[PDB]
Each structure stands twice: as C-alpha cells, then as structure tokens.
C-alpha cells in the first residue's frame, strides 16, 4: 500500500516532492484540474504585478544556488513560471482529481475522490492552500475605472494592489479603519538598498527578547514621538495591540503590508517607467497617498448608507462607486474523520509548527504557515524537510509524536501567552519558524561553535533562509556554499546589521525608538521622503496611463475631495511642521563607526572594549532555551 499521499501540488509540495524523490520514498499526488489562483489569473491574462517578497525569499534553495545574482522583488509572471516549471518536471506523478474525505484510522488513511475512486496511503500530506473571496475579486477588477471613489473596510496586500490600480485613474480612495501596519519593502543603509528581510538578523533573539524587541518593533509599535514617522502624523493607522501577550516579538500572529517607496521605487523603475510598469512593478506607496491626500484615512464608524451609496464625513455626503471589504482566508481542507468517525476542527494553535494535528495520524499540513515578511518559500522549503524527515525516519517521528501535546503547549506558552487564538495565529517571523524548524530537524547552528567573527556575523547577522541552513548535514543542496558566498559579499557579511544590535545594547525601548529615528532616512514610513517625489508621481501616473491604455481627466479638482482630505491630515497639518532639520544624524554615525570597526577586526579570532565584551557574550547566549524543543 503507498506511503506518501500528497493532496495539492502548486508551489508548496515542490520540496517535499523533490526529497521524497531522491530518498526513493513511494509517493503520489492527487490535484484538482481546477488549479490555482495564479492559473485564474494567468488564464485571465492578470499576472500584472510583482512579489511583496524577495527572490531570496520567495524561491526554494535548489533555484536559488542556480539562479542567484542580486537581490530583487521578482514579478507575479516569474513565480508562477516557476510554479509551472515544476509542475512539468512532476506531473506524471500528479493524478487530476479532487479529494473529498479522508478517513483517517490507525495505520492508514482512506481518500476518496470526486471521481469515485478511493486511495489508501500510510502517510498524508495536505498543501491545498487558502480560499479569499478576494482572488475572485481581483479576477474581475476593471481596471480602467476613473474618477470615482473607492471606500475599503479592511487593509491588506490584496487590498493595497488594487489601490495602487486605481490611483493612476484620478479615483479617490477612502478607508474606514482601526488601523494597519506598513512598511517598506526596501530601505536605505547609508545610502545603499537592502530588502527588509535582509536586517532582521532573528537569532539576536538569543541574546534577549527584550533587546531583539528593541531592534525591530519602534517601527510597529507607536514608540517615538519623532513627529516625521506615519504614526504620529496619522494615528488613525494605530492598531489596539492589546492581545499581545508573548515576550517573543514580533509577535506571532502580528501581520504587516510591505510596499514600494517612492523613493526606492524611483531609484529602480524611473528610466524604463512604462515597461518596468508593464512587467509588473507598480507603485503602491501607502504613506505617499496619505501624504498627497489621494487616500484618507476616517474613524471605522464613519456612516455608510449603502442605499444612496453615500458616505457621510466632514459635513459631505461623498457619494461612492464601489465598497470593497475582503472575506477571511480559509484553508482548503477536505473533510478529515478522526478514525474514519468523528469531523477534525482545524486550529493552528493545535498543531505543532502549524504542521503536525494532534488529533490526526500520519497527517501533515504544508503551506498554512504564513511569514510576517518574505515569502512563502522560507516556510514550505523547511516544512518540507520537517515532513520529510517525520515520513521516512521512525525514530525522529517517535521522538517529536511520543510528547506532542506538551511541545505544543510549551510552544504556545512562548509565542502566544495566554492569549485567545486568534484568526491570525498562523502568521510568524520567518527567522523564527526556520530557525526554530533547523533546531527540531537538527540542521541548526551552535553559538558556541563560532571562532571568529566572522563566524558570529553569519550565525546572528545572515539572514535565516531556508539554504541558509542547508549546507551542511541531512539536507545538503549542492551548491549552497557559493550562493552564501555571493550573499556576503553582496551585502557586506551582514556587517551593517550586526552593528545595529551593537549600538543600542544600553538603550531603553524608548532611548531605541528614538535613535531609530534619527537618521536621515530611517527605514520605515519616514514622511520627509515623500513631498520631493510630487513631481515623478504625475510622471509615474501619465506612463501608468499609457500602458493601461486609457484616457483620464485630471482637470476637475475635486473640491468636495480637498475639503475632506484636509479634515483628515488635521494631525499632520500640526505634527509636520515639528520636523527638525538636524546637525548629526545620530543612527547614520553610529552604523558607519560600527561598520568600520567590524570590517577591520573580521578575520579576527575571538580573543571599544565594551564591544569587545559584548561580542565575546554572543558565544553563550543567556536566553538560548526553546523548551518546546526538548523531549523532557
Ligand atoms: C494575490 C496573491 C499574491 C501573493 N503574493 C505572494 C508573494 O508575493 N510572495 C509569497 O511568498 N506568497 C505570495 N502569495 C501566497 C501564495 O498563496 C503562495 O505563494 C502559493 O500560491 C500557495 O501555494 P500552495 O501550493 O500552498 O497553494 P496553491 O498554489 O493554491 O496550490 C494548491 C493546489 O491544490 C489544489 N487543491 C486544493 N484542494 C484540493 C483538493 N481537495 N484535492 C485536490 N487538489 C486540491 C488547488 O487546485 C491548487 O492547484 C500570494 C497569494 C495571492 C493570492
Ligand atoms: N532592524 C532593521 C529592520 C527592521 C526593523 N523592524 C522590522 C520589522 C520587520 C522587518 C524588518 C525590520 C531596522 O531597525 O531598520
């Protein structure tokens, strides 16, 4: 009878089959001939946009050490090429159906399908991905629609696209809200551009929580008071953070909307506009909207009559063309019989690693992880080696199932406290959930085993990428070493990273937030980069038009809409004549003196002299201890 059923093939299994594969594991794929959301799109010719996530992030490891140069957001046309690609290299092994039950019982589960026939497999793995109402709505969005006005409920990456589709068309965009958080996609280091998952340097956290909390949430949480940064000229994006309740942050569960800045964005795109417009790359700068007043932001009870299609805010009664609220992603799982009798309830919190149902046997999840940033693939490439290694080694499967139920409260414990589950449990830190996938696999690093520091520049400052753990051990992908080597030297070892921590070892979360705010560019939502860019945002906006084929009238200023914009940036209007003009930029000083530092002293074997302390600590972290890692 077989071994492996996989239920789903699109861009999660792709690892898991690539292992099962090479160890010769007995397998079969069963997926609709329905297909995905990026098969709807492709088939409605709609793959016009870009990743939120970089390439070194959001393709697996065997592409990577093969097509590696730079880092970059690649296109929506290239992932999924990607996905297809694979497809082809694995169909013969891929049956077209659609699975309707499993049965799970003792030593099997029974699969039924829509056809009528019926499977037995040892093993089942389901990566059948989420349903969003807001897919369909996305394959049916105009986009030549001009000179209306769009009211949103909710923020989000899907929501923000079709934000960026229709500001091009003199549309004006409305957002009833209690907040959301943004962030770029890319930022400066003194001068030069680093994707935002290149400077989270996640193993910090072993260090302290509370350190590794001041290296990253100044920009979520509303720390400073410097009056250039989004949440203090609009506190209307504030969210109520009060369910988090985990010493561990970013919390799990905490999820953000990565985007293009104009300034990064212009940087990249301004001498090939049209075409770099056409392949995908469109600008969806949030705070730049709010700056220039083509989106608002109003209090989530402002009045909707849905009748007369009217909203009612600063004494005017706006008429709008179309409301647009998103749905709840779903999982998409079939109907799971705990023995083949009682219906199985999904919740991630009660599974481990969002993998592994305690109520279930030999049943696996892959791809319901969600990463607070990059992509999907960091998740689903250590998944895979996770389930790999659970379906052909009995004693790694014996010794993760024999205490599951107390690694998956000691796990919740760390990550979630004593809050409620939340719709949004599944999403967590990328360099987290690798890092905390390598140590249960094995495939981790050790502090202790770095000797010079070099050796500490990789273990804390380089990035926790799903190959960054895969050149040595069970999961070795050939090739890895020189792909690390490119990454390096392409981003200075990670130097500039690492010196971040450094500089604030002392500090409060406070004395934190606001020296993350006094560079000249601090990395996210930084107000004083927006106003300068006025003039290429009406050169962005003619060429966007050209490509769309359309024709827009931009004469009429809406003065109903001027009225209402200035009611909104009333807290702008005060806060932003408060911005300073500085004689020392205080985080741009300390990065470059700490750099400097760094690179003289690389080679050296571990052997200011309170850096010096300080990096001889980072051998034996204090606050190392996972305990949902151990078998007691
Ligand atoms: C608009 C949009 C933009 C995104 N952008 C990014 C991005 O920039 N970066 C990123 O990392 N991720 C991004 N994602 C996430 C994206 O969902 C994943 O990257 C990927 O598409 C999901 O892979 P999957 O294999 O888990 O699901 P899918 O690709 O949806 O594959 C699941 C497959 O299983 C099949 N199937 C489902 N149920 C059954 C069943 N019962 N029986 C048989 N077959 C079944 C489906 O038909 C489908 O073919 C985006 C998602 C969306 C919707
Ligand atoms: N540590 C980097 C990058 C960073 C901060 N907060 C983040 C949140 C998410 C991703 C990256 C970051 C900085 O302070 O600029």
Redesign the pocket.
């Known amino acids: 009878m077989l071994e492996v059923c996989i ?7 792709i690892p898991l089959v690539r292992e099962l594969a090479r160890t010769q594991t007995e397998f079969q794929i ?3 001939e ?6 709807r799109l492709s088939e409605s010719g709609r793959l016009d946009f ?4 970089s390439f070194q ?2 393709f697996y490891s065997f592409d990577l050490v093969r097509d590696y140069e730079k880092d970059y957001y690649p296109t ?1 046309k290239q ?1 999924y090429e990607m ?1 297809e690609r694979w497809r082809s290299v694995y169909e013969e092994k891929i049956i077209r ?4 039950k499993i049965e799970n019982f003792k030593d099997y589960s029974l699969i039924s399908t829509r056809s009528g026939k019926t499977y037995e497999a040892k093993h089942v793995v389901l ?4 349903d ?1 109402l807001m ?1 369909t709505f ?1 394959s049916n969005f105009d986009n030549h629609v001009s000179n209306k006005t769009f009211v949103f409920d909710t923020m989000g ?2 929501a923000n ?1 079709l934000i960026a589709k229709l500001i091009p068309n003199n549309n004006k965009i409305i957002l009833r809200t209690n907040g959301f958080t943004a962030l770029d996609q890319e930022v400066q280091v003194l001068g030069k551009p680093f994707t935002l998952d290149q400077l989270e340097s996640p193993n910090f956290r072993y260090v302290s929580s509370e350190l590794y909390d001041r290296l990253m949430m100044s920009p979520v949480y509303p720390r400073t008071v410097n009056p250039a940064v989004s949440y203090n000229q609009f506190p209307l994006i504030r969210r109520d953070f009060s369910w988090v309740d985990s010493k561990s942050s970013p919390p799990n569960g905490l999820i953000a909307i990565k985007y293009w800045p104009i300034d990064q964005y212009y940087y990249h795109f301004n001498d090939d506009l049209e075409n770099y417009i056409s392949k995908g790359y469109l600008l969806n700068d949030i705070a730049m909207w709010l700056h220039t007043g083509k989106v608002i932001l109003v209090p989530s009870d402002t009045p909707i009559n849905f009748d007369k299609k009217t909203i009612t805010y600063a004494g005017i009664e706006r008429s709008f063309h179309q409301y647009v609220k998103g749905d709840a992603e779903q999982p ?1 799982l ?1 109907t799971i019989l705990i023995n083949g009798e009682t219906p199985f309830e999904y919740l991630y919190r009660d599974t481990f690693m969002g993998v592994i149902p305690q109520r279930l046997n030999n049943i696996y999840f ?2 319901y992880t969600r ?1 607070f940033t ?4 960091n998740i ?1 490439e250590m998944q895979s080696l996770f389930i790999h290694k659970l379906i052909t080694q009995p004693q790694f499967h014996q010794k993760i199932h024999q205490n599951l139920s107390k690694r998956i409260t000691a796990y919740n414990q760390h990550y979630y406290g004593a809050a409620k589950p939340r719709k949004h449990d599944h999403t967590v830190p990328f360099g987290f959930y690798t890092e905390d996938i390598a140590r249960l696999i094995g495939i981790h690093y050790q502090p202790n085993e770095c000797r010079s520091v070099r050796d500490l520049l990789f273990y804390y400052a380089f990035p926790n990428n799903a190959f960054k753990y895969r050149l040595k051990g069970e999961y070795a992908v050939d090739g890895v070493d020189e792909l690390i080597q490119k990454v390096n030297d392409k981003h200075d070892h990670y130097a500039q990273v690492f010196v971040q921590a450094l500089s604030i070892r002392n500090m409060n979360s406070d004395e934190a937030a606001e020296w993350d705010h006094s560079a000249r560019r601090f990395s996210f939502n930084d107000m004083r980069h927006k106003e300068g860019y006025r003039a290429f945002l009406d050169t962005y906006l003619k060429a966007y038009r050209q490509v769309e084929n359309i024709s827009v009238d931009d004469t009429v200023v809406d003065e109903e809409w001027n009225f209402m914009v200035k009611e909104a940036c009333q807290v702008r209007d005060k806060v932003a004549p408060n911005i300073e003009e500085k004689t020392h930029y205080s985080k741009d000083e300390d990065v470059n003196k700490g750099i400097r530092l760094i690179l003289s002293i690389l080679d050296s074997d571990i052997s200011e002299a309170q850096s010096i302390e300080f990096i001889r600590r980072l051998l034996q972290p204090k606050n190392y201890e996972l305990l949902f890692i151990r078998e007691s």
């Not at 239920?7 to 299994?13: C, V």
């Not at 990566?127 to 989420?130: C, V, Y």
């Not at 990059?374 to 693939?377: E, F, M, V």
């Open positions: 239920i789903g093939f699109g861009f999660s299994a069963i997926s609709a329905s297909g995905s959301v990026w098969d870009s990743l939120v996530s992030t959001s929506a992932f996905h159906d659609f699975v309707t990566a059948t991905g989420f969003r897919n996305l990456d899907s696209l998409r079939p892959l791809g990463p990059g992509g999907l693939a689903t």
